[PDB]
Design a protein around this ligand. Structure first.
Ligand SMILES: Nc1ncnc2c1ncn2[C@@H]1O[C@H](COP(=O)(O)OP(=O)(O)O)[C@@H](O)[C@H]1O
Ligand SMILES: Nc1ncnc2c1ncn2[C@@H]1O[C@H](COP(=O)(O)OP(=O)(O)O)[C@@H](O)[C@H]1O
Ligand SMILES: Nc1ncnc2c1ncn2[C@@H]1O[C@H](COP(=O)(O)OP(=O)(O)O)[C@@H](O)[C@H]1O
Ligand SMILES: [Mg+2]
Ligand SMILES: [Mg+2]
Lengths: 259, 190, 45, 255, 257
DNA sequence: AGACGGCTGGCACGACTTTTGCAATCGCAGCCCT
DNA sequence: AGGGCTGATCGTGCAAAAGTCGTGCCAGCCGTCT
């Protein structure tokens, strides 16, 4: 069925169309990949697809790629336990093994080791089970999700990403409307975050928006799309002031030393 | 302080202990040794129970000193896993042997499970419990018109005013637990 | 850190387990049980 | 033991090589790019091998645990510092005449290389703290994406591996080389896709873009062919969806 | 409620910073700092935790430096059972340490970028990344940081990914330099003189010469508070110093003969 | 002179507890079975 | 004359299925003022 978007911080410009395309793509479980910028709704899109985890039993599995340290990461792929490692314990299967059928959210880190990604890809392509040992991989389907945070065919040229892994990945991409692109509900989602901030503050009432402030908001380079906008929103909210003035100063650059 | 008089003492018969080694019969010595091993295991079991009880009791009295001093109204949310983590108490032997321990303190006589109070929500990093809620609700119903007792909604308002935020559902439920007539049933002609 | 060799106990069940189960009981429950047990042993006081 | 035959005369000769080799258990290589389907052909040989009822199951060379390499082909028997269990042998020990396609051989450790170089020795399976080795006949087969001589000039794999190279590695024709049943392959792939797409049929169809796809990079013979097929189909998903203006450019900026 | 301990923060900007902290105290968001060296920052962080006055312990206190192997701070999100070798049951720790609390980020800049990414991944959603096969689990706790590291500099360096850097942007604090603070410095100097006279319970606070305070000013004073505390005991080290005022402050522990 | 209204307790689900039900293979070497 | 085979000892948990609370939630009911 359909679940209410707990957040729909969406862009009427084309993230409306982007969300529509996502909805159209949603029903199948084939390869799922996205694309976006530093902090550019991409987690929010992950939530979008997780709601689009159709029907029920959407097992949300997160693959925080730059995690897993160095060593046992290999096990985190496949599965620990038996008597294998320096310990012995019950079958904690690999993270992919732990979730059967689940949604496989890729963290778009781009792992340094192509072979480690390839080993995940071989398990990702199909699961034949590990009847020999939990050290191996098993017989599991899963919904899978990818996204982009960098230049894909460049890295293909840059040799950063293996072509075979790339060929299996990105069957259907999902690019994102940047802050330099989406720019749609800037004032709209701006006051949305403002109301959220007031309610969090249990605040009396929104003082408003300054025309100078709105002009700056239009002029903002917005180095971060989604959050950094909300970040500066929080910045001004904490900056705060009398209800007499609707908005005061610019919260775009909190880093700057306080006056 | 552990009730040492209420703490039994297991003594081994030393005359039998001196009357078995000299036994030129192996069967008597073997039976005596087995009995000694069993008795030692039993005495060690009782002593370990006593010692773990003392340690966990120190941990709880530290946790429930506010419950010990101010009372059940100021009874903090106390749990075994939190107490075990706080006092490094047994992870499972404690969960086993925790049954049936009683204490006499300035508050009165309290059970072992009576020391541990449930968990209730409190904003601003504060924390809340169950026995606290019971005593507070008793006071709030006391702080009602003799003709008209405090409503479960009124009790919820009082709890939220205290920062407990019990809400009307738990308020009515705990008033049922407190076993008192609420407003529309405790209503009396003035 | 990684995996290789190295690394290395156990508890007891039944008799030690029964002794431990005796302690989860009540105080006077332990006292009457102790009396009943001491009814047998010729090497205890 | 078959699939959507690429339907190629080259494919015919490659299948001929496979069939000629079919009874033989000689170790075998392959140099196939993604979408080649050489693995599928390899396993097709495995089922169609002389050991039809044989235990034939691969294990990615990239798989092995950093230290468990000995525990990779052999399997734990006694001790090993586990202090318990560790009485299970290796899947490679679990082979015995069966098949484990040496996929991912393009990347295994030079350490892994030499340990296998021992495995290339005839028989003699040694396990941890062992008594007597096991001379366990097992069928060997592999495929790579790159050039064995290229690695050799790099010295990437030891020439011991080249010795390990035993059967003539047939190679999949390139996409530009294959160019065999592109419309037909599209037809079968789209039959399957519409089955998955659950749409009735491709009323649009058309074939001008089929020839346009004949002018395509096709990096993956089946990796991209069907991949782009589904990409375009899903972008369409309509009955009247023809071979016109359907692009394979999921990375590229569409309009 | 609970009152934070006295700190000699006589700088007017320091009072302003305290006030900013006070406003933030009801708030609950990230709290970063410029980490002035020899400057007692996490003491202010404690005053914050103290200002929150949260029930139980929300004032976690652990740095990054000792987390030499990645595994250590990795185990700030600990291990559950049997991942690697289980040396003890429920290797989890330092995470529930502020069960309903906050995190003090010390030596944060030294942390691994992979470690940093893991931390940030924890930040928003809160998922429990426990090593070994299991399910995550959130907790309503916070975090806070204080480091001499220049954040714009590291962003240029890209030492940590920018996502986390912004994710931390909720409260900054540039502590004044030790060479920046002078009047508060002498104030705390007398304060530490008295505090030592108390804790050691020596009969008499000797005092210090005007020359003594002046020369201590002529001292490098790299740490306004950390160096001062060492100097305090350094003069307290001298025997009979308490009876009469002396300018004998032991700078170099290696100084001898 | 029937609806408001809070009672007020029945009903509910998970969330914290919890109680019981669980002992071995050693180790040789002599004795028993074959 | 050779194989089986034997246990004398081998002791602070847990885990597992179950239960049970907290809190909510809901449905009728009575005092009454309409
Ligand atoms: N409507 C919204 N609801 C919730 N969070 C929002 C909303 N709009 C923006 N955000 C915030 O903006 C950010 C979205 O970018 P995110 O997906 O976190 O970055 P990245 O693309 O680097 O993964 C998050 O911090 C998110 O909380
Ligand atoms: N003859 C074929 N019929 C149908 N599909 C094929 C055929 N050959 C290869 N494929 C496809 O190729 C994919 C396997 O990729 P593969 O070519 O094995 O990569 P690599 O050759 O690099 O190992 C499978 O999904 C399979 O559907
Ligand atoms: N008000 C105070 N009371 C006691 N000790 C203090 C106080 N302020 C600072 N310190 C001491 O100064 C030392 C270092 O302080 P600080 O400069 O904040 O550390 P860092 O070098 O990490 O900034 C700490 O060990 C602390 O004990
Ligand atoms: Mg392949
Ligand atoms: Mg410091």
């Amino acid at each position: 069925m359909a679940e209410y978007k707990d957040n729909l911080l969406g862009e009427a410009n084309s993230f409306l169309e982007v969300l529509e395309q996502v909805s159209h793509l949603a029903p199948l479980d084939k390869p799922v990949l996205i694309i976006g910028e530093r902090g550019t709704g991409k987690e929010l899109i992950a939530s979008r697809l997780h709601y689009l985890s159709s029907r029920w039993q959407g097992p949300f599995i997160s693959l925080n790629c730059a995690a897993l340290n160095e060593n046992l990461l290999d096990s985190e792929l496949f599965g620990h336990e038996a008597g294998a490692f320096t310990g012995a314990q019950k079958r904690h299967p690999g993270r992919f093994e732990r979730a059967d059928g689940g949604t496989l959210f890729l963290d778009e880190l781009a792992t340094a080791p192509m072979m480690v990604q390839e080993k995940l890809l071989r398990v990702i392509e199909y699961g034949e089970l590990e009847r020999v040992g939990g050290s191996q991989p098993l017989q599991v389907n899963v919904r899978l999700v990818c996204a982009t945070n960098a230049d894909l065919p460049a890295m293909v040229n840059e040799g950063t990403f293996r072509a075979d892994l790339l060929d299996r990945l990105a069957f259907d991409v999902v690019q994102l409307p940047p802050l330099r692109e989406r720019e749609s509900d800037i004032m709209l989602m701006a006051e949305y975050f403002a109301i959220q901030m007031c309610r969090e503050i249990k605040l009396p009432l929104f003082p408003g928006f300054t025309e100078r402030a709105r002009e700056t908001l239009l002029n903002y380079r917005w180095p971060g799309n989604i959050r950094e906008l909300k970040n500066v929103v929080e910045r001004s909210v904490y900056r705060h002031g009398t209800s007499d003035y609707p908005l005061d100063d610019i919260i775009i650059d909190p880093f700057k030393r306080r006056p | 302080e552990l009730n040492a008089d209420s703490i039994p003492r297991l003594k081994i018969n030393q005359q039998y202990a001196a009357m078995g080694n000299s036994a030129r019969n192996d069967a008597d010595g073997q039976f005596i040794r087995s009995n000694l091993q069993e008795a030692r295991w039993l005495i060690k079991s009782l002593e370990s129970r006593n010692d773990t009880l003392l340690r966990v009791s120190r941990c709880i009295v530290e946790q429930q000193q506010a419950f010990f001093e101010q009372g059940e109204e100021y009874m903090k949310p106390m749990v075994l896993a939190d107490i075990a983590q706080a006092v490094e108490m047994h992870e499972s032997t404690i969960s086993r042997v925790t049954t049936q321990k009683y204490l006499h303190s300035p508050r009165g006589i309290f059970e072992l499970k009576y020391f541990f109070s449930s968990h209730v929500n409190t904003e601003g990093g504060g924390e809340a419990s169950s026995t606290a809620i019971r005593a507070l609700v008793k006071k709030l119903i006391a702080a009602e018109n003799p003709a008209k007792p405090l409503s479960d909604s009124k009790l919820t308002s009082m709890l939220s005013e205290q920062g407990i935020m019990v809400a009307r559902r738990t308020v009515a439920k705990y008033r049922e637990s407190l076993s008192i007539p609420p407003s529309n049933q405790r209503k009396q002609l003035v | 850190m990684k995996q290789g060799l190295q690394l290395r106990s156990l508890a007891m069940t039944p008799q030690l387990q029964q002794a431990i189960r005796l302690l989860q009981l009540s105080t006077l429950e332990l006292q009457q049980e102790l009396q009943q047990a001491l009814e047998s042993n010729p090497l205890l006081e």
